[PDB]
Amino acid sequence: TVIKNETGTISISQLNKNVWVHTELGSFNGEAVPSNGLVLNTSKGLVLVDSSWDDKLTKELIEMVEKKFQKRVTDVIITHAHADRIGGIKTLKERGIKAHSTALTAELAKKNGYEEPLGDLQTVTNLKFGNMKVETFYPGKGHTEDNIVVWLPQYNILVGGCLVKSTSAKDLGNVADAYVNEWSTSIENVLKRYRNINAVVPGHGEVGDKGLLLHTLDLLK
């Protein structure tokens, strides 16, 4: 079940009854790049694991899902401080959408001139939205020093964010702010914490399973 917007710039694909993957075509260093996040349809509203590249795409994403699910977006979890993930923060703040992040992600967003997310997430934080349980985990440095992953324990779904590469990725992409040595240890920390994974959603590309984590370890050698 896939649904696209008016221009084909935003798509949502259903993983299960209450979890959808959102994908928006954005731009990085002048090139068209699609990126992923999750839409969690909860009894108390919609929660996004990552919003989009910038304010224009974030507004469109929010409007698309609020209309389809007939509920408001109430919270967003931001996985790292780069423009590619924090870009729509102004939209979130002005609409009263809670933007969750670790303290380090919030410090980095401010340092880079963006409005600040909450800085409320710890190394391990367990959130409950309606009947939807969400666990956030900081595994260590990798794609950036602050990257976190998100786990849905009722579905064993792991949102890897930019820390995890899809099978189609043949290189590490943007490593300007990366820690390539620690990145392997961080992926091992995720594999040690989540031993039974049904699906892994990479930052970009197709949904896979633990093989995407093993693929990322190989790209790091």
Side-chain angles (χ1 to χ4, degrees), residues 4-18:
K4 288 194 174 184
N5 64 324
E6 306 162 58
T7 307
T9 197
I10 298 173
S11 179
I12 59 178
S13 301
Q14 191 167 208
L15 282 195
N16 59 59
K17 305 177 181 179
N18 288 170

Side-chain angles (χ1 to χ4, degrees), residues 99-118:
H100 304 277
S101 74
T102 59
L104 180 55
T105 293
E107 77 107 9
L108 293 170
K110 163 169 263 41
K111 189 168 72 74
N112 281 282
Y114 289 96
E115 289 296 321
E116 296 177 64
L118 292 168

Side-chain angles (χ1 to χ4, degrees), residues 6 9 17 22 32 34 36 52 55 67 101 104 106 129 155 192:
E6 306 162 58
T9 197
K17 305 177 181 179
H22 67 82
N36 308 321
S52 202
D55 288 304
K67 188 173 180 299
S101 74
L104 180 55
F129 302 101
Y155 307 108
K192 289 191 314 77

Side-chain angles (χ1 to χ4, degrees), residues 121-122 124-129 133-136 151 153 193-194:
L121 305 179
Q122 306 306 300
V124 176
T125 294
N126 276 277
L127 308 167
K128 197 119 59 183
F129 302 101
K133 291 184 302 148
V134 179
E135 179 174 86
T136 63
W151 175 243
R193 190 176 179 81
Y194 306 117

